[PDB]
Structure formats: structure tokens, C-alpha cells
């Protein structure tokens, strides 16, 4: 087999946007194997060693006035620039979630019906899924599987609700997402 | 509220090199180091924006030179293998004979080299499968997705077989129609 040791090098330029291009932070970072060694935070304005292994570079690069000046303007020429370039298909991308409600295939405890609210194929990831019993929100018994990023610019999530079903009751799954002006609702008639 | 990351890496001695852009965890594109061209994650992206693939090849060359410098500086300290967390799911609730897609999520691992294969009833599947490149993580490990388009049935069973230096044995995540 292949047993030779591996040596890895990573370089990451992170552009952080707060309220559009209002506040922008650039973070350039170097990682040797699994360790960040040196970085450039636009908030600091210069390279800073993260570990001794990076000290030589932080010192060396900071001695290059040209680089420092160029890096300092990257927040505009790089970050804000690229943000505006892809804004239309990233920041504004929207795909409505598919919503469906059905009882769980498990159903452990007898006189209890575990309801499942499946919310899938949506974008962006920001979303609010709530459960209501007869128009009044439910806090307890609610358990989510978490937000799942499918890797294809799509998300999905399952939100359960254990209940003590009584004929006539109306359990509603409400979903709020940027893809819709008004919340989506799917009812389960007990 | 939003993060755009230009992520790149070089791995010795595999000679692996990568260059990609990330938007809130999702890949915008990466550069094919051999064909020297921009590969967009979604087709429509390439109709709204462009990227000079040639530029990534310049960065990669510097990335490797720096790897060599750093390797020597650490007195050839090798990377510690971290085995992946593997999970299998469908992209939507499964229903008999209703078109779906099996997703094999390979996460939290390093170095970025894995062997992934799909198994339909113990046999390898090659038809319709697709995969993504290595995606960055805040902790500096990687993620990766493998896909298998299928038609649910009570008869078929699947497995995502993953091999990585951090795994003493190949890991198999089973999946079968339960709902």
C-alpha cells in the first residue's frame, strides 16, 4: 500500500459581508497541515503569525509596503468587486421549498402520534419552520433534524412534533422563507 | 451575513492541486487543472459570470513552492490523517418508483484524498453517478459529496463505500427503502 507521509498547504481568502457591501472584512489565511500559521485580517491591517511556524512570513510580507497597500484595498477591489459580480445568482438566488406533512414510520409510544414536516429542495438556507396546534404555536415536543446542505445549492430539513391526537384538532406546519411573501402552511387534521 | 471564499491547496506527494470559490458553503466553481478551464457548479452561473482559469494555475505553482518551503521548515512534519464522517441520505422523502437521488456526505476529514464507490446489492454502480471536488471547512478539514440517481424499490439496497488513510478498513454506509 501507499504509506508515504503527506504534506498539505492551503490558502484561503475569506470575504465577509455585513449588510451587503456596507461592512466588509477580508481574511487571508495560510494553513500548513491542519494548522493555520499566518494570516491577514483587514481589521488589523497587516500580517500576523498564528504560530511560530508562520512568524518568518508575517515579518517578511509586512516589510513589503506595496503588498500591504494592495492587500489593504482588496476589501474593495476584491471582495466588494466579486460580491457585485455574483450578487444576482447567489445573494438573490431563490428556490421555494417543497413542503409535505405525514406521520412518522416509527411512532414509539402508543397514544401518541409523531408528525413529520418535510421541507426540502429550498434556497437559501435561512428558514423558519413552526408547528401550531389549533392556531397556537408549540414549543415542547418539537424536535428538528437540523439544516442539511445538499451540496447542490439546495437544502432540506425535517421537523417532528409528538402529539396526543384528539379528533377535530388541527396541527399546522408553518414555513417562512425568503422565496415567499407569505408563510406556507400544511395542516394535519386529527 | 455572507461569505465568499477563494480556497486553494496543494498536496505532496500526491501532487493534488485545487482552486475553487465558495459562497456560504456552496461551490460557485473550481478550475480543472488539466483542461485549464472554469467548471461552474451550476450551469447557469457560467452564463452570468466568467473567470480566467489561467490565473488559478499561477497561484497553484506558488502554492506548491510554498508547500516545499513549509515542509522543510517544520522538519518534514507530516499531516495527521483524520478519517471522514460518512452519511447517506436522499435529497427528498423517498416514495416507491418515484425518482430520487442518493447523497453520500463525506465530511470532517484530511488529507483531501478519498476513494468512494456506490453499491447496488453488493455490486458497484457507475451509471449516472457524479461527485464534487473537495470543499473547505472552517476547521480546515474537508467535505465532499457523491451522488447516485435511482428509482426506489423494496428490492434494491445500497451502500456508499469510502476509503481513506485514516480508516483502518473501508467504511460502508447502508441505505434501503424503509419509509
Amino acid at each position: 500500500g501507499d504509506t508515504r507521509p503527506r504534506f498539505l498547504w492551503q490558502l484561503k481568502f475569506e470575504c465577509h459581508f455585513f449588510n451587503g457591501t456596507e461592512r466588509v472584512r477580508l481574511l487571508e489565511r495560510c494553513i500548513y497541515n491542519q494548522e493555520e500559521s499566518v494570516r491577514f485580517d483587514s481589521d488589523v491591517g497587516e500580517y500576523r503569525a498564528v504560530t511560530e511556524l508562520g512568524r518568518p512570513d508575517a515579518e517578511y510580507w509586512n516589510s513589503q509596503k506595496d503588498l500591504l497597500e494592495q492587500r489593504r484595498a482588496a476589501v474593495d477591489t476584491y471582495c466588494r468587486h466579486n460580491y457585485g459580480v455574483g450578487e444576482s445568482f447567489t445573494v438573490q438566488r431563490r428556490v421555494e421549498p417543497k413542503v409535505t406533512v405525514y406521520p412518522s414510520k416509527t411512532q414509539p409510544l402508543q397514544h401518541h402520534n409523531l408528525l413529520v414536516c418535510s421541507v426540502s429542495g429550498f434556497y437559501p438556507g435561512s428558514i423558519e419552520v413552526r408547528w401550531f396546534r389549533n392556531g397556537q404555536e408549540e414549543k415542547a415536543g418539537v424536535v428538528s433534524t437540523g439544516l442539511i446542505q445538499n451540496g447542490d445549492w439546495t437544502f432540506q430539513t425535517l421537523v417532528m412534533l409528538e402529539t396526543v391526537p384528539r379528533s377535530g384538532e388541527v396541527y399546522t406546519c408553518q414555513v417562512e422563507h425568503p422565496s415567499v411573501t407569505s408563510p406556507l402552511t400544511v395542516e394535519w387534521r386529527a | 451575513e455572507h461569505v465568499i471564499i477563494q480556497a486553494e491547496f496543494y498536496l505532496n506527494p500526491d501532487q493534488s492541486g485545487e482552486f475553487m470559490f465558495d459562497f456560504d458553503g456552496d461551490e460557485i466553481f473550481h478550475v480543472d487543472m488539466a483542461k485549464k478551464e472554469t467548471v461552474w457548479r451550476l450551469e447557469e452561473f457560467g452564463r452570468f459570470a466568467s473567470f480566467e482559469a489561467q490565473g488559478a494555475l499561477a497561484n497553484i505553482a506558488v502554492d506548491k513552492a510554498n508547500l516545499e518551503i513549509m515542509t522543510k521548515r517544520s522538519n518534514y512534519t507530516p499531516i495527521t490523517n483524520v478519517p471522514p464522517e460518512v452519511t447517506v441520505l436522499t435529497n427528498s422523502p423517498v416514495e416507491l418508483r418515484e425518482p430520487n437521488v442518493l447523497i453520500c456526505f463525506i465530511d470532517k476529514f484530511t488529507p483531501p484524498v478519498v476513494n468512494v464507490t456506490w453499491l447496488r446489492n453488493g455490486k458497484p454502480v457507475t451509471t449516472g453517478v457524479s461527485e464534487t471536488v473537495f470543499l473547505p471547512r472552517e476547521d480546515h478539514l474537508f467535505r465532499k459529496f457523491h451522488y447516485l440517481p435511482f428509482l426506489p424499490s423494496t428490492e434494491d439496497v445500497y451502500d456508499c463505500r469510502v476509503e481513506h488513510w485514516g480508516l483502518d478498513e473501508p467504511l460502508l454506509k447502508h441505505w434501503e427503502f424503509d419509509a
Binding site: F13, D57, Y78 | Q6, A49
Partner: peptide, 13 residues
């Protein structure tokens, strides 16, 4: 519209 990338600087030899 074209994406701009950041150039990598060489390390201290």
C-alpha cells in the same frame, strides 16, 4: 462580469 482572484505571494525562503 468577471471574478477577480487574489494572487498568492511567495514565502520567506
Amino acid at each position: 462580469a468577471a471574478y477577480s482572484d487574489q494572487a498568492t505571494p511567495l514565502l520567506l525562503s
